[PDB]
Design an enzyme around this catalytic site. Structure first.
Site, PDB file in Angstrom:
ATOM      1  N   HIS A  43       0.806  -1.221   0.000  1.00  7.24           N
ATOM      2  CA  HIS A  43       0.000   0.000   0.000  1.00  7.24           C
ATOM      3  C   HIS A  43       0.840   1.272   0.000  1.00  7.24           C
ATOM      4  CE1 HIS A  43      -3.548  -2.407   0.781  1.00  7.24           C
ATOM      5  NE2 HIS A  43      -3.100  -2.810   1.955  1.00  7.24           N
ATOM      6  N   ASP A  85      -2.354 -10.913  -1.916  1.00  8.20           N
ATOM      7  CA  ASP A  85      -2.913 -10.332  -0.704  1.00  8.20           C
ATOM      8  C   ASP A  85      -4.380  -9.991  -0.965  1.00  8.20           C
ATOM      9  OD1 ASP A  85      -3.546  -7.776   1.044  1.00  8.20           O
ATOM     10  OD2 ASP A  85      -1.759  -8.648   1.994  1.00  8.20           O
ATOM     11  N   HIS A 144      -6.047  -7.565  -0.191  1.00  7.94           N
ATOM     12  CA  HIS A 144      -6.233  -6.148  -0.477  1.00  7.94           C
ATOM     13  C   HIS A 144      -5.492  -5.751  -1.751  1.00  7.94           C
ATOM     14  CE1 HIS A 144      -6.571  -6.405   4.025  1.00  7.94           C
ATOM     15  NE2 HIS A 144      -7.690  -5.762   3.742  1.00  7.94           N
ATOM     16  N   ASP A 159      -3.878 -12.836   4.077  1.00  2.00           N
ATOM     17  CA  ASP A 159      -5.138 -12.415   4.671  1.00  2.00           C
ATOM     18  C   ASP A 159      -6.369 -12.814   3.849  1.00  2.00           C
ATOM     19  OD1 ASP A 159      -4.059 -10.595   2.787  1.00  2.00           O
ATOM     20  OD2 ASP A 159      -4.435  -8.838   4.046  1.00  2.00           O
ATOM     21  N   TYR A 217      -3.201 -11.960   9.089  1.00  2.70           N
ATOM     22  CA  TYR A 217      -3.354 -11.596  10.497  1.00  2.70           C
ATOM     23  C   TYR A 217      -3.846 -12.701  11.407  1.00  2.70           C
ATOM     24  CZ  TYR A 217      -2.580  -7.465   8.005  1.00  2.70           C
ATOM     25  OH  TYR A 217      -2.006  -6.539   7.169  1.00  2.70           O
TER      26      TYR A 217
HETATM   27  C1  LIG Z   1     -11.394  -2.977   8.519  1.00  2.00           C
HETATM   28  C2  LIG Z   1     -10.797  -1.571   8.834  1.00  2.00           C
HETATM   29  C3  LIG Z   1     -11.924  -0.582   9.148  1.00  2.00           C
HETATM   30  C4  LIG Z   1      -9.785  -1.627   9.987  1.00  2.00           C
HETATM   31  C5  LIG Z   1      -9.986  -1.896  11.345  1.00  2.00           C
HETATM   32  C6  LIG Z   1      -8.882  -1.891  12.225  1.00  2.00           C
HETATM   33  C7  LIG Z   1      -7.617  -1.607  11.751  1.00  2.00           C
HETATM   34  C8  LIG Z   1      -7.391  -1.330  10.400  1.00  2.00           C
HETATM   35  C9  LIG Z   1      -8.486  -1.333   9.489  1.00  2.00           C
HETATM   36  N1  LIG Z   1      -8.512  -1.078   8.100  1.00  2.00           N
HETATM   37  C10 LIG Z   1      -7.401  -0.537   7.294  1.00  2.00           C
HETATM   38  C11 LIG Z   1      -6.411  -1.603   6.803  1.00  2.00           C
HETATM   39  C12 LIG Z   1      -6.654  -2.975   6.987  1.00  2.00           C
HETATM   40  C13 LIG Z   1      -5.761  -3.965   6.539  1.00  2.00           C
HETATM   41  C14 LIG Z   1      -4.576  -3.623   5.868  1.00  2.00           C
HETATM   42  C15 LIG Z   1      -3.565  -4.670   5.349  1.00  2.00           C
HETATM   43  O1  LIG Z   1      -2.501  -4.333   4.980  1.00  2.00           O
HETATM   44  N2  LIG Z   1      -3.922  -6.062   5.329  1.00  2.00           N
HETATM   45  O2  LIG Z   1      -3.044  -6.992   4.872  1.00  2.00           O
HETATM   46  C16 LIG Z   1      -4.343  -2.250   5.683  1.00  2.00           C
HETATM   47  C17 LIG Z   1      -5.225  -1.273   6.141  1.00  2.00           C
HETATM   48  C18 LIG Z   1      -9.937  -1.047   7.577  1.00  2.00           C
HETATM   49  C19 LIG Z   1     -10.463   0.341   7.040  1.00  2.00           C
HETATM   50  C20 LIG Z   1     -10.030   1.615   7.494  1.00  2.00           C
HETATM   51  C21 LIG Z   1     -10.540   2.803   6.970  1.00  2.00           C
HETATM   52  C22 LIG Z   1     -11.509   2.713   5.962  1.00  2.00           C
HETATM   53  N3  LIG Z   1     -11.964   1.522   5.482  1.00  2.00           N
HETATM   54  C23 LIG Z   1     -11.436   0.387   6.014  1.00  2.00           C
HETATM   55  K   LIG Z   2      -3.852  -8.148  -4.000  1.00  2.00           K
HETATM   56 ZN   LIG Z   3      -3.856  -7.190   2.984  1.00  2.00          ZN
END
Ligand SMILES: CC1(C)c2ccccc2N(Cc2ccc(C(=O)NO)cc2)[C@@H]1c1cccnc1
Ligand SMILES: [K+]
Ligand SMILES: [Zn+2]
Ligand SMILES: [K+]
Length: 357
Positions: free
Chosen positions: A133, A171, A173, A264, A304
């Site tokens: 990201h 991944d 995402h 994930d 995770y």
């Molecule tokens: C589910 C969510 C609500 C959340 C809750 C608790 C902590 C983080 C996050 N998110 C961000 C996020 C998650 C995974 C990864 C990654 O790298 N996975 O491999 C990178 C970023 C989500 C979010 C944030 C704002 C807007 N929409 C979604």
């Molecule tokens: K991907």
């Molecule tokens: Zn991810």
């Protein structure tokens, strides 16, 4: 044929000082490494040393302004670490973060060099914080520097500028940072499979849809496979590899394959909500090993559920070492929505990849 492995305990130091249970946990890499030991896979591998990436190598993909602000976090008081982190989308920073992100990058560099000079056929990188990201100028979603994007440019820098590098991002995402860095680039083929939900899934951007195929010379070299309305598993991922990933990759004829290997989408991951199994990941790895004379570097991104990621990445390493791919299932028609996603990708990339059907 040798398989390389890089792992460094110092990457554990990066932590969230306001939530010690944040799912991007230091123990992700120690639990994966430990499982490699218990399964007797670690002893089968050539151990590659970790190292810090240099600031010049970070400049292959990132702006000096982004590099310098992250470098400066190593000396910040907690209050400023918190404000700085809050300037990004879903980022936490500790004083050790910069060094850990340098170590995850330099680790992958050494792995890529090991593969490209012949020291090993393929390799696996057990690293953190993740990378995909991260954008040229900003951090995002637990990623500071784009480890995979840096490794492709690093590989080109130690060989020739036009080295053909495929990045497969499985991944769950979308790797918005990796897409954006190479969007105009026809020397780096980026293929992402990702939960999309019409743009309602993190990173919450239509940039992840199937109709973003690249810009300029890079048109056709950005393949987005978005999943909508459906708990995708092995049958769907295997179908996307059959109809899209492998045909496109083979037509591209990469000389190096980088896997942005988030786990994930694995069964058991609460962030992903998908159900790819360890044997599913094993099969995806095995299909990738048919490219690029086997030059496959698997890079840990997300993932995770500690047990899931440890079993799943171990499965991938077992495949790199040459173990037989394990049995999966039969028939199991895809979820309806997955045929739709796959067909949509096929249509948007038919103009660019003449072997697509
Ligand atoms: C589910 C969510 C609500 C959340 C809750 C608790 C902590 C983080 C996050 N998110 C961000 C996020 C998650 C995974 C990864 C990654 O790298 N996975 O491999 C990178 C970023 C989500 C979010 C944030 C704002 C807007 N929409 C979604
Ligand atoms: K991907
Ligand atoms: Zn991810
Ligand atoms: K590209």
């Amino acid at each position: 044929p040798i398989t390389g492995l890089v792992y460094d305990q110092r990457m554990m130091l990066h932590h969230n000082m306001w939530d010690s249970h944040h799912p991007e946990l230091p123990q992700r890499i120690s639990r994966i490494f430990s499982r490699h030991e218990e399964l007797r896979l670690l002893s089968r591998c050539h151990r590659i040393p970790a190292r810090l990436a240099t600031e010049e190598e970070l400049a292959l993909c990132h702006s000096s302004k982004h590099i310098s602000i992250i470098k400066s976090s190593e000396h910040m008081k907690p209050r400023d670490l918190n404000r700085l982190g809050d300037e990004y989308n879903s980022i936490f920073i500790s004083n050790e973060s910069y060094t850990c992100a340098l170590l995850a990058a330099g680790s992958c560099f050494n792995s890529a060099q090991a593969i490209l000079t012949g020291q090993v056929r393929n390799a696996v990188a057990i690293v953190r914080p993740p990378g995909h990201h991260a954008e040229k100028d900003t951090a995002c979603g637990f990623c500071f520097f784009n480890t995979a994007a840096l490794t492709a440019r690093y590989a080109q820098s130690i060989t020739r500028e036009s080295l053909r590098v495929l990045i497969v991002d499985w991944d769950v995402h979308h790797g918005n940072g990796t897409q954006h860095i190479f969007e105009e680039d026809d020397s780096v083929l980026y293929i992402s499979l990702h939960r999309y939900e019409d743009g309602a899934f993190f990173p919450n951007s239509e940039d992840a849809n199937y109709d973003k195929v690249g810009l300029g010379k890079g048109r056709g070299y950005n393949v987005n496979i978005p999943w909508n309305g459906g708990k995708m598993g092995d049958p769907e991922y295997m179908a996307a590899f059959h109809h899209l990933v492998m045909p496109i990759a083979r037509e591209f004829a990469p000389e190096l394959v980088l896997v942005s290997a988030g786990f994930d989408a694995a069964r058991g991951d609460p962030l992903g909500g998908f159900q790819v199994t360890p044997e599913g990941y094993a099969h995806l790895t095995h299909q990738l090993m048919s490219l690029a004379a086997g030059r496959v570097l698997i890079i840990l991104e997300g993932g995770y559920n500690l047990t899931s990621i440890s079993e799943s990445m171990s499965m991938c390493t077992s495949m790199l070492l040459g173990d037989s791919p394990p049995s999966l299932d039969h028939l199991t028609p895809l979820k309806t929505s997955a045929t739709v996603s796959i067909n949509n990708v096929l249509r948007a990339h038919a103009p660019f990849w003449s072997s697509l059907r």
